[PDB]
């Protein structure tokens, strides 16, 4: 069910008249790399993004493999045809019909409700298919924006994982939210 977006035949999940998710493709690496440079300062404070463009290319290629194999998913949020952020399943547990969600949005597109609409469209898409029923978000207790997205979208705080993630020199507590659909 691919669909044309330039010479490129993409997998898309509709979101609204102006928003849609497109599966990351190699063609997205240059623009995605630039988006990452622009927001690098705060992305580095989060678990949502691991230097050069070749490094980005590597990351994208690895995720495309996982995406195609159903081990995870990597979608790019496009707003009116312009790349605005990333939304993914960091991991999928097919037997448990469970998935962990990761996400981030370029600073310029923030505050328009884009992430919630994108998130909602992603979960509805996989939940209708009956493929995923348990959606999980794990984020630093101290990442205000990531926690807000979870709280805006019917996720229940299941517990706080003590010093669960190593980032920039320290171990950080991380909240675990879930929603069953």
Number of H helices, E strands in the chain: 4, 10
Region binding its own copies by CB under 8 A among candidate stretches 9-17, 25-33, 64-72, 93-101 = 93-101
Closest approach, Cβ 93 to its own copies, in A, equals 9
Mention every residue, 6+ apart, whose C-beta is less than 8 A from residue 169.
none
When binding is defined by CB under 8 A, the residue of 41, 51, 81, 95 that contacts its own copies is 95
Residues 14, 8: contact at Cβ < 8 Å?
Answer: no
Q: By CB under 5 A, is residue 138 in contact with Cl ion?
A: no
Which H or E run includes 32? helix 29-43
Q: Which does 162 bind (CB under 5 to 8 A by kind): its own copies, Cl ion, none?
A: its own copies
Using the CB atoms, write b or e for 109-127: b if 16+ within 10 Å: beeeebbeebbebbbebbb
Q: Which does 2 bind (CB under 5 to 8 A by kind): Cl ion, its own copies, none?
A: none
Q: By CB under 8 A, is residue 139 in contact with its own copies?
A: no
Mention every residue, 6+ apart, whose C-beta is less than 8 A from residue 110.
none
Tell me the binding residues.
Answer: 46, 103, 105, 111, 113-116, 139, 143, 152
The annotated binding site for CoA is made up of 46, 103, 105, 111, 113-116, 139, 143, 152
Which residues would be at the binding site for its own copies (CB under 8 A)? 95-98, 133-134, 156-166, 171, 176, 178, 180
């Amino acid at each position: 069910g691919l669909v044309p977006r330039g010479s490129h035949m993409v997998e898309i999940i509709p979101v609204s008249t102006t928003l849609e998710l497109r599966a990351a493709d190699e063609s997205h690496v240059p623009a995605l790399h630039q988006l990452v440079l622009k927001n690098k300062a705060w992305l580095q404070q989060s678990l949502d993004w691991p230097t050069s463009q070749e490094e980005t290319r590597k990351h994208v290629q690895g995720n495309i493999l996982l995406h195609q194999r159903g081990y995870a998913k990597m979608y790019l949020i496009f707003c009116q045809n312009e790349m605005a952020g990333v939304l993914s399943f960091n991991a999928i547990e097919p037997i448990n019909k469970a998935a962990y969600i990761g996400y981030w949005l370029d600073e310029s597109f923030q505050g328009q409700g884009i992430m919630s609409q994108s998130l909602q469209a992603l979960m509805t898409h996989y939940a209708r298919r009956g493929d995923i029923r348990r959606f999980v978000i794990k984020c630093r207790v101290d990442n205000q924006a990531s926690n807000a997205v979870a709280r805006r979208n019917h996720f229940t705080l299941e517990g706080c994982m003590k010093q669960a993630e190593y980032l920039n020199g320290d171990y950080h507590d991380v909240n675990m939210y879930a929603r069953i659909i």
